[PDB]
Enzyme design. Sequence first.
Site, mmCIF file in Angstrom:
data_model
loop_
_atom_site.group_PDB
_atom_site.id
_atom_site.type_symbol
_atom_site.label_atom_id
_atom_site.label_comp_id
_atom_site.label_asym_id
_atom_site.label_seq_id
_atom_site.Cartn_x
_atom_site.Cartn_y
_atom_site.Cartn_z
ATOM 1 N N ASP A 1 -41.823 -37.657 -5.910
ATOM 2 C CA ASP A 1 -40.626 -37.302 -5.157
ATOM 3 C C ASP A 1 -40.377 -38.249 -3.991
ATOM 4 O O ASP A 1 -41.308 -38.714 -3.327
ATOM 5 C CB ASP A 1 -40.736 -35.868 -4.636
ATOM 6 N N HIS B 1 -37.053 -37.591 -2.064
ATOM 7 C CA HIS B 1 -36.325 -36.654 -1.206
ATOM 8 C C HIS B 1 -35.675 -37.357 -0.018
ATOM 9 O O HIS B 1 -35.907 -37.010 1.140
ATOM 10 C CB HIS B 1 -37.246 -35.531 -0.727
ATOM 11 N N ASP C 1 -36.372 -36.233 -7.682
ATOM 12 C CA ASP C 1 -36.118 -35.705 -6.340
ATOM 13 C C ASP C 1 -35.856 -36.808 -5.311
ATOM 14 O O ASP C 1 -36.587 -36.987 -4.336
ATOM 15 C CB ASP C 1 -37.277 -34.808 -5.896
ATOM 16 N N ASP D 1 -31.544 -34.110 -1.768
ATOM 17 C CA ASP D 1 -31.903 -32.775 -1.280
ATOM 18 C C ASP D 1 -32.916 -32.750 -0.141
ATOM 19 O O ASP D 1 -34.135 -32.799 -0.340
ATOM 20 C CB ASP D 1 -32.388 -31.887 -2.426
ATOM 21 N N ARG D 2 -32.354 -32.685 1.067
ATOM 22 C CA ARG D 2 -32.899 -32.573 2.416
ATOM 23 C C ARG D 2 -33.404 -33.872 3.024
ATOM 24 O O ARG D 2 -33.723 -33.872 4.214
ATOM 25 C CB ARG D 2 -34.046 -31.547 2.513
ATOM 26 N N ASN E 1 -35.406 -31.691 -10.649
ATOM 27 C CA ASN E 1 -34.632 -30.454 -10.597
ATOM 28 C C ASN E 1 -33.653 -30.401 -9.431
ATOM 29 O O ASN E 1 -32.713 -29.599 -9.469
ATOM 30 C CB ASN E 1 -35.571 -29.248 -10.583
ATOM 31 N N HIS E 2 -33.842 -31.224 -8.399
ATOM 32 C CA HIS E 2 -32.889 -31.252 -7.297
ATOM 33 C C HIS E 2 -31.677 -32.124 -7.604
ATOM 34 O O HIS E 2 -30.713 -32.120 -6.831
ATOM 35 C CB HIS E 2 -33.586 -31.736 -6.022
ATOM 36 N N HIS F 1 -41.069 -34.849 -14.630
ATOM 37 C CA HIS F 1 -40.985 -34.250 -13.300
ATOM 38 C C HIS F 1 -41.704 -32.907 -13.227
ATOM 39 O O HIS F 1 -42.577 -32.704 -12.375
ATOM 40 C CB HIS F 1 -39.519 -34.095 -12.890
ATOM 41 N N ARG G 1 -40.886 -20.093 -8.049
ATOM 42 C CA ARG G 1 -39.618 -20.801 -8.168
ATOM 43 C C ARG G 1 -38.434 -19.874 -8.402
ATOM 44 O O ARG G 1 -37.302 -20.242 -8.071
ATOM 45 C CB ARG G 1 -39.701 -21.840 -9.287
ATOM 46 N N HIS H 1 -43.319 -32.362 -7.717
ATOM 47 C CA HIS H 1 -42.520 -31.228 -7.250
ATOM 48 C C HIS H 1 -43.199 -30.291 -6.248
ATOM 49 O O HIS H 1 -42.498 -29.556 -5.544
ATOM 50 C CB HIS H 1 -42.004 -30.400 -8.433
#
Lengths: 155, 356
Positions: B80, B82, B108, B111-112, B140-141, B189, B241, B268
């Site tokens: 990830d 991110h 990922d 997302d954030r 998944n993000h 992932h 989750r 993840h």
Amino acid sequence: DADEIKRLGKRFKKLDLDNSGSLSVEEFMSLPELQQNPLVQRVIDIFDTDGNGEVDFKEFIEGVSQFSVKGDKEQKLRFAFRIYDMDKDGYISNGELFQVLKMMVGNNLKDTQLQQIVDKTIINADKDGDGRISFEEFCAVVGGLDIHKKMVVDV
Amino acid sequence: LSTTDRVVKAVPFPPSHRLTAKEVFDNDGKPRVDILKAHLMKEGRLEESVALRIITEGASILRQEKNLLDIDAPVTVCGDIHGQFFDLMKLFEVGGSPANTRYLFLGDYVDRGYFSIECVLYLWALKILYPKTLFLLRGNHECRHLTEYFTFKQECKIKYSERVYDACMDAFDCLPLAALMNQQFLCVHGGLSPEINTLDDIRKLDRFKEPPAYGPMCDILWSDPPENFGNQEHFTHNTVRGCSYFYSYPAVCEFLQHNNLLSILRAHEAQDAGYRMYRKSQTGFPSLITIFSAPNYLDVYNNKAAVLKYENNVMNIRQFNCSPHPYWLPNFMDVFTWSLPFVGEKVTEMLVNVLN
Ligand SMILES: [Ca+2]
Ligand SMILES: [Ca+2]
Ligand SMILES: [Ca+2]
Ligand SMILES: [Ca+2]
């Protein structure tokens, strides 16, 4: 309204501790809850449309008149607009935007972060390239927030 | 102090000029990634048409790749990101230049992290320039549900436009789901799925869409091993989750035997050491290895990241720490939206007390 004229007479007289006919910053600051409010001098300066440092009765009346229940949305948003426009030219410029954010935030932001976000707001919001924010851009940005509903005062 | 000139002069003012197509793409259309990397390192922006051209060319390249790529060793596999662009920079420092290093990313990107669009733009440029040595999988993000739930949409609207966001979403729909590494390792992932019994089940999926809230695409992107993995049901409801499943050790061993695989690799979930080796299969070889490349997760975890460089029949885990990055207020709010409620509150309080 009669009771309103009477209340404004009584409050004016009560605040004018030295009976000079005008309210100084020190005279406002005689009120204990005002002694620790860091924005007193800014509001007084805005009221002081003639720049003599004090609020005369005419200034007092015109200032209170913008907070009447009968005042429309534009009047409130224009008062808020005039809060930022220290120099009263009708446009928020870089220098005054910096100054007003610095007065309001104190130590809640570092000088670097505040200068960066001032720069970025000026760049993203200036659409005519003059480096300042016109009234049209202001209403384009804030018109949809419905903030006018909270700026209501009962006299 | 001056009210117009800049206070902190040691900080260089970022360039405002938007790079044109001739300055970023040479006569043959390849991105000039050293200039682009320097500009993005300076928080520089592109012309809208150039961002859209990079995004759509990268999407078209991902679109032409298989669900399961055939990638020989050596390769560096990465988890990830991110939105941690300056940590992506550190990742490339640790793993080696893409000019001579094969890369696999496990998703990922968004997302954030507050450099998601810079991550997308740089990775897409590397993918266009290095189509067979830099690889990007979907996490998944990478979907509309989460990017509309998290902060990526606001980031797109602050720095570019919502159209750029939509272009990112269409590119993300093109992201491959898995990698076959050295004909030995399946890299994904999330992990395994009840609806995938053969590689042909992966090849047959329709990936060109927003990931659903449930179903095989969701589980591929979202499932995790149990937090107590290794210490009888093959698949159990994933209560952490809120979707997809936990898979068990018998499940993993059965998958490995049926598909002739050696191990599985996914991401993840943050780990204090940057990796976790779970219970070994019934040879001494660990049945599962987790690798996680997102340092200081959520800016508070203080965790290390790692990547796995598989080369010369050696699996060398290389960890690295997070790097500093410039600050953004939460959800990319501008200073007027941020401050006006407080201004109105304190001015109203002052006026009420002065008057009453
Ligand atoms: Ca006086
Ligand atoms: Ca003065
Ligand atoms: Ca000036
Ligand atoms: Ca300016």
